[PDB]
Design a protein around this nucleic acid. Structure first.
Ligand SMILES: [K+]
Ligand SMILES: [K+]
Ligand SMILES: [K+]
Ligand SMILES: [K+]
Ligand SMILES: [K+]
Ligand SMILES: [K+]
Ligand SMILES: [K+]
Ligand SMILES: [K+]
Ligand SMILES: [K+]
Ligand SMILES: [K+]
Ligand SMILES: [K+]
Ligand SMILES: [K+]
Ligand SMILES: [K+]
Ligand SMILES: [K+]
Ligand SMILES: [K+]
Ligand SMILES: [K+]
Ligand SMILES: [K+]
Ligand SMILES: [K+]
Ligand SMILES: [K+]
Ligand SMILES: [K+]
Ligand SMILES: [K+]
Ligand SMILES: [K+]
Ligand SMILES: [K+]
Ligand SMILES: [K+]
Ligand SMILES: [Mg+2]
Ligand SMILES: [Mg+2]
Ligand SMILES: [Mg+2]
Ligand SMILES: [Mg+2]
Ligand SMILES: [Mg+2]
Ligand SMILES: [Mg+2]
Ligand SMILES: [Mg+2]
Ligand SMILES: [Mg+2]
Ligand SMILES: [Mg+2]
Ligand SMILES: [Mg+2]
Ligand SMILES: [Mg+2]
Ligand SMILES: [Mg+2]
Ligand SMILES: [Mg+2]
Ligand SMILES: [Mg+2]
Ligand SMILES: [Mg+2]
Ligand SMILES: [Mg+2]
Ligand SMILES: [Mg+2]
Ligand SMILES: [Mg+2]
Ligand SMILES: [Mg+2]
Ligand SMILES: [Mg+2]
Ligand SMILES: [Mg+2]
Ligand SMILES: [Mg+2]
Ligand SMILES: [Mg+2]
Ligand SMILES: [Mg+2]
Ligand SMILES: [Mg+2]
Ligand SMILES: [Mg+2]
Ligand SMILES: [Mg+2]
Ligand SMILES: [Mg+2]
Ligand SMILES: [Mg+2]
Ligand SMILES: [Mg+2]
Ligand SMILES: [Mg+2]
Ligand SMILES: [Mg+2]
Ligand SMILES: [Mg+2]
Ligand SMILES: [Mg+2]
Ligand SMILES: [Mg+2]
Ligand SMILES: [Mg+2]
Ligand SMILES: [Mg+2]
Ligand SMILES: [Mg+2]
Ligand SMILES: [Mg+2]
Ligand SMILES: [Mg+2]
Ligand SMILES: [Mg+2]
Ligand SMILES: [Mg+2]
Ligand SMILES: [Mg+2]
Ligand SMILES: [Mg+2]
Ligand SMILES: [Mg+2]
Ligand SMILES: [Mg+2]
Ligand SMILES: [Mg+2]
Ligand SMILES: [Mg+2]
Ligand SMILES: [Mg+2]
Ligand SMILES: [Mg+2]
Ligand SMILES: [Mg+2]
Ligand SMILES: [Mg+2]
Ligand SMILES: [Mg+2]
Ligand SMILES: [Mg+2]
Ligand SMILES: [Mg+2]
Ligand SMILES: [Mg+2]
Ligand SMILES: [Mg+2]
Ligand SMILES: [Mg+2]
Ligand SMILES: [Mg+2]
Ligand SMILES: [Mg+2]
Ligand SMILES: [Mg+2]
Ligand SMILES: [Mg+2]
Ligand SMILES: [Mg+2]
Ligand SMILES: [Mg+2]
Ligand SMILES: [Mg+2]
Ligand SMILES: [Mg+2]
Ligand SMILES: [Mg+2]
Ligand SMILES: [Mg+2]
Ligand SMILES: [Mg+2]
Ligand SMILES: [Mg+2]
Ligand SMILES: [Mg+2]
Ligand SMILES: [Mg+2]
Ligand SMILES: [Mg+2]
Ligand SMILES: [Mg+2]
Ligand SMILES: [Mg+2]
Ligand SMILES: [Mg+2]
Ligand SMILES: [Mg+2]
Ligand SMILES: [Mg+2]
Ligand SMILES: [Mg+2]
Ligand SMILES: [Mg+2]
Ligand SMILES: [Zn+2]
Lengths: 46, 103, 163, 99, 186
RNA sequence: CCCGUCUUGAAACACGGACCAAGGAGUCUGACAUGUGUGCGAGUCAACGGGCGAGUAAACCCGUAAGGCGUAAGGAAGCUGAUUGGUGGGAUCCCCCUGAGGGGUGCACCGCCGACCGACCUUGAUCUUCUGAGAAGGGUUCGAGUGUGAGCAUACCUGUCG
RNA sequence: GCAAAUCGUUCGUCUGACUUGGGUAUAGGGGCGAAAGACUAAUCGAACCGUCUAGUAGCUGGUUCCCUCCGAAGUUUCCCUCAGGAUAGCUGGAGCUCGCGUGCGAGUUCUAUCGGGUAAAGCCAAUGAUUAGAGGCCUCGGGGCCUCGACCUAUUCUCAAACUUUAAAUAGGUAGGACGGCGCGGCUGCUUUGUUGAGCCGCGCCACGGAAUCAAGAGCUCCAAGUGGGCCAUUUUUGGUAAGCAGAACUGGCGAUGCGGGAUGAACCGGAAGCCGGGUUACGGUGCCAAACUGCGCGCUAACCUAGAUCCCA
RNA sequence: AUGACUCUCUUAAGGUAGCCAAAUGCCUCGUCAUCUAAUUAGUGACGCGCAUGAAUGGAUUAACGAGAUUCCCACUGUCCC
RNA sequence: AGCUCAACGAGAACAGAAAUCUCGUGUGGAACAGAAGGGUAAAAGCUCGUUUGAUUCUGAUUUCCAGUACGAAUACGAACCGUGAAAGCGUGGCCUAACGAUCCUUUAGACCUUCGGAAUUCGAAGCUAGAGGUGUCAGAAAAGUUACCACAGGGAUAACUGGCUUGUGGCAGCCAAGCGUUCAUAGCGACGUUGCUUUUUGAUCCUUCGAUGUCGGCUCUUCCUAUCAUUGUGAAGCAGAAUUCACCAAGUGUUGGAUUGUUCACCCACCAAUAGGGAACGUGAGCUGGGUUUAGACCGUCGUGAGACAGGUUAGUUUUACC
RNA sequence: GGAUGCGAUCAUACCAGCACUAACGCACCGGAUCCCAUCAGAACUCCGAAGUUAAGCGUGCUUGGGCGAGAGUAGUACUAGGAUGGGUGACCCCCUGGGAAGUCCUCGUGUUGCAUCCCU
């Protein structure tokens, strides 16, 4: 019916793969009120 | 069906193998048509091998109305303006088209 | 779904601690959360809104967003051969500020000054920590020696308090 | 399930774009037209020989339907539709509890 | 027994030579095998590796993009392991020294008209054996149709991958799964 | 211990096989796709046909507003249609210095964030033929888009499908 | 076999609904049937012949040269899905981007910190189950002032996968710098009573690499095969009297793998392998079979039951 | 002991005349009689009959049967052998 | 917003175990629609006041998970509202379940788009959001029978033997309450408890479905012992006779018949005795074919019917050795 | 040294009984015209200042209950890894490591921020 036998072995053949971490992360899903103001702040930055 | 591929739509469910048209006679057709033209040229000598004179007509629809091409034959109004009776025109190598209008 | 509800198997994990029910102390609502801070997720059973899935209970994550009543938390989740960066929002009642990095900031300053004090005197050093190494030799003053010997067996003593 | 006769809800009409009084009535599916393209195609498919050419559902399972409230704004005289959960007994303007 | 993976051998594959049979390319490879070995120049090593690469790994460089990257660098020699194409969108062509595997007929004419020079990699070795005063450029590798179909599948969330469809229109993959009015949008 | 075979497991009291010769099974074709080789390149393709030509089914030549694919997308449609890059890493090269050094250069690629075109929404000084034009100003929306093209032809392996 | 229905003996009927020749009529979803689905040219619960037709098959069988390299899966989800398919995982090929110890990587530990409710424990703690007496014997019932039981107080025996205050071992998460820190300025339509915050930006300065060990290196993409019946063992563990039974958990093993040992054996012990010479071992052995002591020591056993004689293991 | 009789629920009608452990009865090798030294067989009876019954024909029946069954006499290599 | 519940204690005409009223104690022992768990006390419970956030517009995230959809849930943004003095709370139900694609139909919304020669008005077709349902719930439109049967396969899977197991069946031991006139143990062994056996039946599904001939009897050999008789002995509640218990012991023997296809059983009779079993439930190219288990046929019950019946009945081809 | 207002930590702070308190406070307390409030001026609300520290609040005490800490229970129970270890089995010793919990015993009974005021 079911079994986890051999599944950890399969996962470790090429894993465990950690996601690539970049200096800047996506802003999707953050507070739109904060994001909108930040966009204006960069627009008038000098 | 497997993997990421375009959805197949081959129209090969009938008895298509009985309706295959090969082109192995393509060189022969070129030879036969050239011989027919050569034979025709001697028959109508000294009349030009290009055949009857054809009019200039516009291409149809918005996609081709900027170009001109050969039409079927000169209209009756065109022949009358040129002073050529319609019954005499075809006998001197002028194509006649009694259907074409002049807008 | 598919045989298990959202809060299945949470009888013990999501229950309040013994004699620690009722009103939530207000120091929970006076905490300040900034982007980049580390927080430990600990589900409070009394607050039913903005509560994380049972998996994220007992996990430490990094704050990536701040809202009026909740903080966005990034939590690692192992799925087969990959680690996924799960971004979840949780009401601040379920999060505690983690002390996993409490030593880092104070350690950097000490390293910076030690290197500065060594740079002026032209003595190259290393500020790295080291694990417990072997102890040096030393002398121990003699004292009365208590002799330890095996004890004769007694069946009557093979029971807590004896038979 | 008992629903009040009137209800003060948001109106999407550009005239109002605000909360206004609405009259509550129950939606009822209209009569199927013979001129609808789907009906025109089905009648063509059914003509001649071949018998029934489309499936006919038989294994009914639901014992209820999702009742839809028809809310007519009293300002702009426009209608909005608001479905409610499944229920076996439904009425509009029934006597309230206790009263 | 030894506790290693594949007996400690590498499982990576890289091109150690060109796949082409072009006799002129093989002569260039021989020339730059010698230059890389006897000079230790990083420029020569990079040039040698790129001569092995397949066609898609040697994308063309438009003349207009060549001009923009060469602005303010007239003295330097532009080097491209690939083909230089002409761009009708560029109007003013300054004099420039360009070394490339191939120049299109229009690109060569425009460069030569402007007083520039079109060089081959054997001529570059005589002028810059170590790559001195060179501007090494690469064309856009991922600007092609095939790449648009790569990445996450078209049907997964947050995907802009182009699907494989035999035609374009309302009747070709615009229904269920592509809008909320038909099941879901994906 | 008898080979072949299905099988968790075959020397099997599992099946095929008395012996030898010869014959005997992933092919051809259409569509598409990735990869690679080759030609040309914002183009590419002599493909129907024509002109011919080894007295010739080949080869050679011909695209004049032909056609296919590409060169512009979004929208159901009416329609409208790309103001032309900022930044963190980074190959190579140049200078100083001879440090896990500091400046200049910053291609490819990746991450991040604007702008532009379109669907949807929103916005409207000033004009107009009253329904259009558009000064300014937008959006947690949506797109197989734009921000100095990369394609087309052809050969073959592999894969999906008829 | 004389014979794809015959032979021997024995039997039914024998002037009749009798037997038989020839002619003639009925033809395939049709005929004909005193009816057996009988018969219709050795073919009948739908004849025979040709064609459609190389009919379709998730099922059975087979599938043709050599070395070399890499090398699986019996698991996930969906499916009138359960002998199948797709999907993800595992695998190959093609590379590409970089890197050479300054690596930012790790089926490991160390340091700091966080979560837990199993094992055990607990009832002299809640809930439930449960044994016995003791005192008080106020007040209730029971019977005969007495008296048993209810009651109250302090004790007491024994318990729980769906009880618990408490509470391990093992395992789980996070962090240990150059994507760090500080200083001075700037941007905002967000935020504040407030250039107050928040985030970002510019400039300047500092940053011996900021635990150990290792690092036959790291990242990224494309195309695609096979597989989706598993089985065994230590330990945890459910159903079952039990099973070489059925079903799960972690790891290893077999399957795909020979080789030495266990007499013999897919899984036990040892150990994994190019073709050879020398040396030494692992497990297991050194009376013969059979390479190596009837080696050097102590004790126990005497089996007139086939004394006894090596993990799994009989 | 049995139930003519009475009470009560109830059907379109409640199996009547007959017949039966039947080629139809589960229980069952039913009970009694008979046949035998001995009978799960046979026959004759008995019947609250799992599940008998009237042209889905019931109950009989002389004559007939390469039809199923039991017994007796004759007969015998079926058997003792 | 105010209030505090279950229960108990002490009090009050009728009034009591239990009506209502008063005080006191009261960590929730109550209540919160439903299953269970968790959660909650100036509340999430109870009583009142005002109300419709059970609203409109997208997107993001979680659970499921392929990191697809659906359902459900959560955190924001932009509107419009409710409630409160206000902070604040409210996007249904305290939390964990309560539900549904394509096509088609129908409704709502947008002084919207199209009907392709140009217009107008009907009609029709589109765009956006809901509704009518698929419960086999990622969603065909679906009744039987075959004993007249067919094909592809399956030992992935039943009906024998064998194997594991031994609950059940069978056989044996230990303790000693009691029985035995007296007397635990001549002979017995309650309450318990330890085993053996594979001549019972089950459990399992490992071998066999390109087939291991499937009941019983007949015939014939060999083997076992847990000994019925026979040889030699010990014990007795063994006077004799007969009988019982136990030991060595498998050398020899263990029969003729009625009824039944039987295995089993039962009776008659003889006998020293008429013990129990194995050998692929020994034995079909050894027989036999009564039974079971093809096709004909009858009855009863069941079914509308075709037909069904570990119900009864009768007729029904038993092939080959020379390796 | 304290009180009061707002608090933080939420029993070392709770519960029970007994005892005690200068000053300013905090209370009890007086009244019901107005706002408000009920069956009920009890509560809530408003206005007030005659009386009292009786209660509340505060502090102390108890071989008090509870709670908190230690010791002990105990290297015990359990547990990770190992063995061609023992044993018919059930189970168990040893090796490399980790390591609890009632009873009993001792001790403790809050700490503290801002503001105002009293002791002054
Ligand atoms: K032809
Ligand atoms: K369950
Ligand atoms: K039809
Ligand atoms: K096979
Ligand atoms: K097989
Ligand atoms: K064989
Ligand atoms: K593909
Ligand atoms: K073209
Ligand atoms: K041409
Ligand atoms: K649209
Ligand atoms: K005769
Ligand atoms: K037929
Ligand atoms: K199948
Ligand atoms: K305990
Ligand atoms: K208890
Ligand atoms: K697959
Ligand atoms: K007869
Ligand atoms: K309230
Ligand atoms: K009370
Ligand atoms: K289904
Ligand atoms: K047994
Ligand atoms: K078989
Ligand atoms: K035989
Ligand atoms: K017969
Ligand atoms: Mg066909
Ligand atoms: Mg023409
Ligand atoms: Mg599902
Ligand atoms: Mg699951
Ligand atoms: Mg018609
Ligand atoms: Mg009709
Ligand atoms: Mg080696
Ligand atoms: Mg290998
Ligand atoms: Mg629809
Ligand atoms: Mg989605
Ligand atoms: Mg098998
Ligand atoms: Mg084999
Ligand atoms: Mg065998
Ligand atoms: Mg086979
Ligand atoms: Mg054979
Ligand atoms: Mg051959
Ligand atoms: Mg190509
Ligand atoms: Mg053209
Ligand atoms: Mg438009
Ligand atoms: Mg725009
Ligand atoms: Mg003869
Ligand atoms: Mg006919
Ligand atoms: Mg006849
Ligand atoms: Mg028949
Ligand atoms: Mg035929
Ligand atoms: Mg389906
Ligand atoms: Mg198979
Ligand atoms: Mg796959
Ligand atoms: Mg812990
Ligand atoms: Mg648990
Ligand atoms: Mg528990
Ligand atoms: Mg326990
Ligand atoms: Mg399979
Ligand atoms: Mg499976
Ligand atoms: Mg099995
Ligand atoms: Mg296999
Ligand atoms: Mg052995
Ligand atoms: Mg050797
Ligand atoms: Mg010796
Ligand atoms: Mg009668
Ligand atoms: Mg009868
Ligand atoms: Mg009889
Ligand atoms: Mg007889
Ligand atoms: Mg009779
Ligand atoms: Mg009847
Ligand atoms: Mg009848
Ligand atoms: Mg009769
Ligand atoms: Mg008669
Ligand atoms: Mg007759
Ligand atoms: Mg509940
Ligand atoms: Mg909600
Ligand atoms: Mg208000
Ligand atoms: Mg809800
Ligand atoms: Mg809710
Ligand atoms: Mg629907
Ligand atoms: Mg429609
Ligand atoms: Mg028209
Ligand atoms: Mg389904
Ligand atoms: Mg049928
Ligand atoms: Mg099997
Ligand atoms: Mg007994
Ligand atoms: Mg066979
Ligand atoms: Mg055979
Ligand atoms: Mg045989
Ligand atoms: Mg014996
Ligand atoms: Mg006597
Ligand atoms: Mg004998
Ligand atoms: Mg007989
Ligand atoms: Mg047997
Ligand atoms: Mg047999
Ligand atoms: Mg035989
Ligand atoms: Mg036979
Ligand atoms: Mg037989
Ligand atoms: Mg028979
Ligand atoms: Mg029959
Ligand atoms: Mg009937
Ligand atoms: Mg018969
Ligand atoms: Mg008063
Ligand atoms: Mg006082
Ligand atoms: Mg005390
Ligand atoms: Zn309105």
């Amino acid at each position: 019916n079911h079994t986890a036998h051999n599944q950890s072995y399969k996962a470790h053949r090429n894993g465990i793969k950690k996601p690539k971490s970049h200096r800047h992360s996506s802003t999707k899903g953050m507070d739109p009120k904060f994001l909108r103001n930040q966009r204006y702040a960069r627009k008038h930055n000098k | 069906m497997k993997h990421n591929n375009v959805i197949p739509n081959g129209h090969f469910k009938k008895h298509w193998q009985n309706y295959v048209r090969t082109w192995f006679n393509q060189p022969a057709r070129k030879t036969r048509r050239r011989a027919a033209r050569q034979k025709k040229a001697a028959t109508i000598f000294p009349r030009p091998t290009a055949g009857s004179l054809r009019p200039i007509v516009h291409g149809q629809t918005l996609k081709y109305n900027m170009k001109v091409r050969a039409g079927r034959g000169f209209s009756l109004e065109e022949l009358k303006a040129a002073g050529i009776p319609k019954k005499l025109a075809p006998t001197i190598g002028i194509a006649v088209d009694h259907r074409r209008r002049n807008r | 779904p598919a045989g298990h509800g959202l809060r299945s198997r949470t009888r013990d994990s999501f229950s309040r601690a013994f004699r620690k029910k009722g009103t939530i102390a207000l120091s929970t609502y006076l905490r300040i959360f900034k982007i980049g801070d580390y927080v430990d997720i600990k589900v409070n059973g009394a607050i039913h809104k903005g509560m994380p899935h049972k998996f994220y209970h007992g996990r430490t994550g990094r704050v990536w967003n701040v809202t009026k009543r909740a903080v966005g938390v990034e939590v690692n989740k192992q799925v087969r051969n990959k680690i996924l960066r799960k971004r979840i929002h949780v009401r601040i009642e379920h999060v505690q500020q983690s002390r996993c990095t409490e030593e880092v900031r104070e350690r950097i300053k000490k390293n910076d000054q030690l290197k500065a004090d060594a740079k002026a005197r032209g003595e190259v050093i290393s500020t790295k920590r080291q694990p417990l190494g072997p102890k040096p030799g030393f002398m121990v003053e003699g004292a009365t020696l208590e002799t330890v010997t095996p004890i004769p067996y007694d069946v009557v003593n093979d029971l807590k308090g004896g038979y | 399930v008992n629903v009040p006769k009137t209800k003060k809800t948001y109106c999407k009409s550009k005239e109002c774009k605000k909360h206004t009084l609405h009259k509550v009535t129950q939606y009822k599916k209209g009569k199927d037209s013979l001129a609808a393209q789907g009906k025109r195609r089905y009648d063509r498919k059914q003509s001649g020989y071949g018998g029934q050419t489309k499936p006919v559902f038989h294994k009914k399972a639901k014992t209820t339907k999702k009742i839809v409230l028809r809310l007519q704004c009293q300002g702009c005289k426009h209608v909005s539709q608001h479905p409610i959960k499944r229920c076996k007994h439904f009425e509009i303007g029934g006597d309230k509890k206790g009263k | 027994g030894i506790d290693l993976v594949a007996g400690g051998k590498s499982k990576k594959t890289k091109r150690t030579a060109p796949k082409s049979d072009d006799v002129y390319l093989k002569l260039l490879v021989k020339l730059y095998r010698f230059l890389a070995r006897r000079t230790g120049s990083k420029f020569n090593a990079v040039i040698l590796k790129r001569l092995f690469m397949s066609k898609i790994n040697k994308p063309p460089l438009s003349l207009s993009r060549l001009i923009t990257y060469a602005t303010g660098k007239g003295d330097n020699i532009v080097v491209l392991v690939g083909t230089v194409t002409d761009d009708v969108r560029a109007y003013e062509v300054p004099k420039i020294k360009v070394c490339a595997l191939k120049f299109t007929e229009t690109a060569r004419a425009r460069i030569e008209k402007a007083g520039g020079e079109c060089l081959t990699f054997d001529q570059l070795a005589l002028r810059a054996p170590l790559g001195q005063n060179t501007l090494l450029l690469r064309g856009p590798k991922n600007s092609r149709e095939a790449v648009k179909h790569f990445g996450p599948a078209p049907g997964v969330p947050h995907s802009h991958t182009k699907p494989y469809v035999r035609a374009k229109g309302r009747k070709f993959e615009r229904a269920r799964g592509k809008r909320n009015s038909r099941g879901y949008k994906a």
